[PDB]
């Protein structure tokens, strides 16, 4: 498993960073802040070593660092690193990967 | 005209910007005099809605303590948490602050705080369609006032460095 | 497992697209939009690589891409790709396959 | 597993100590006590011998004593040792490790 | 002036600091006289809010028992748990304590307890923006009063070693 | 497993005796009875033979008789032996051991 700035998740946790806030629209209009919620697209920066549940050898996380992923809506813990909010999910909870 | 109390008539010329509202906590009194909080060359933090949490109030006080100038906090109300932070910083080492509610009651306060802001020079935080938050403030975003007097029932700002060329535009707006 | 336009589901997830909206009837009449609900017939476009739960080797998804399936009613996450709503189910939740 | 001052946690339990209270701020201001909650950063001081659940041989705890960890928010039992409050979590509940 | 009861007039000069409030539990009476609790050279624990649990009350009584001096507990109220601890320590081996509530409705007491503290010399616990707790007390944090009388309806502190140079500042504050 | 006075726990249960009641304080003050709750420090007197769940051979209890342990708060059954209240917990529920 790979770490981040003085941080390392345990057994499954993945530390991701949500993407931009989408302030303005596509064409020409601009949006407020109470709207737009939390962006579900994120990038993975920290990955736990391997899955505790796997018998004998640990089962390594599948999402590798530097990937873009479609986060779920609810599950996730807020961590603060360098005054930047990062979100720690579980590897099972990550919906999809933006491979391209 | 008001019902006086003395035997003669009196002419009282309320000068500057005065509103019938005093400080919240009776710990900001640094006068050793008739129950007054008296500042000179103070900053002004104008908030439309309440200052509830310790989070929103800390950056303004950080700016004030860094520049080493007093601070007045004119808001809709100061919640007990930010109030406790303010009183704590006051009673020990001695950050110079004082807080007061808004003068107006309804929409009139929503206009009067903007008037006070442009008279002293700054931005009202928490406006409906402006998207100005307390967490991101800057030293040029706070109003500046020459002299401030806050008693138990009324607050008076006297000298607002508020770019008279724009307060004149405001005056034309209100006269129209 | 096979991917889609810059998207790839995780272990069991399957990305399907619901079929037409059924605006008009069979014979000659026409229907509104507040009615007709969400169509349960869909086509599978993205398939996760394999089942995490399977011990040792991964168990690959059964529904292969390009098939028509009878979706369930409740379970499913809404994803947006290219401004088109696609729905991510789990492979266990897909009721039946329209083989023909 | 390693013990502490006349104390030794059972199978999965891990005993940690929360970090400082963060009385003053970074720049120059100073904060009250009803605020600031419970610090989520702690140091592990006691570690149970091994995991009961593991078949045959015990699975040892991974967080080793003397490390800094990002505790969870809810789970944890309050123990008192030498008139100092320490908190006993389970090893699965510890979110991250501050490796550096 | 009050409606007297005897046939003649009477001049009663209430001396010291007296408030119309007596002890809570009728077990602190150590006088063998007209229902009085009488202490000499006693400590004073001034608390703004209630003393509910056995936790908060134990350190003050520990200090009092270690120094072997009586203790008055002037607080908003003494909950049944701390009250039971106090009465238990009283009826057996004989720790010298007594408890009383505050003088004034809500707001006046917040000032009057502070006046009592500075008149005897100490700190009011539970203050809004002071962050003083009962759990961390010290022998220099308790007030000291020469003579204390507590009957069923009124408490009188007479000789408070309260640093007159500061009670004079308080007097100037209240006169202004 | 070892027994007690005409008593033997089954398959996991541990019979322990809670420690003193803490009537007086450390320095010089003395406390009531409605307070002070139930002491969490206890001594183990009876231990079940072995764990039923373990496949094939039984997994013996870890806390051995004559040890001091930090009991949990809730779990536990009240048994009466010789007009003395003893509490039967499960071996998993015992938090820590006071080794020294």
Author numbering:
A (entry chain 1), C (entry chain 2), D (entry chain Z), F (entry chain Y): 3 to 102
B (entry chain L), E (entry chain K): 177 to 352
Per the authors:
Like GroEL, human mHsp60 can also assemble into stacked back-to-back double-heptameric rings capped by a dome-shaped heptameric mHsp10 (GroES in the case of E. coli) co-chaperonin lid to form ATP-driven nanocages for a substrate–protein to fold in confinement. Features shared by all three structures include mHsp60 protomers in an extended conformation along the molecular symmetry axis with clearly defined domains, namely an equatorial ATP-binding domain (residues 1–137, 411–526), an intermediate hinge domain (residues 138–191, 375–411), and an apical domain (residues 192–374). Each mHsp10 protomer adopts the canonical seven-strand β-barrel structure and exposes a flexible loop sequence of twenty residues (mobile loop) that mediates the interaction with helices H and I of the mHsp60 apical domains.
For the ADP football (stage IV), we conclude with confidence, as a result of the high resolution and quality of our cryo-EM map, that the nucleotide-binding sites in all fourteen mHsp60 subunits in both symmetric halves of the football are occupied by ADP and Mg2+, with no evidence for the presence of γ phosphate or K+. The conformational analysis described above showed the unsymmetrized cryo-EM structure displays perfect symmetry, indicating that in solution the ADP-bound football does not display subunit conformational asymmetry. In contrast, the ADP football has lost the left interaction locus, and the double mHsp60 rings are held together solely by the S464 interaction. Concomitantly, the equatorial gap has increased to 4.6 Å with the buried surface area diminished, consistent with a football poised to split into its two halves. Further, when we superimposed the ADP:BeF3 and ADP football structures, we discern a subtle but distinct concerted pivot of the ADP equatorial domains away from the interface plane, abrogating the left locus and giving rise to the single point S464 interaction.
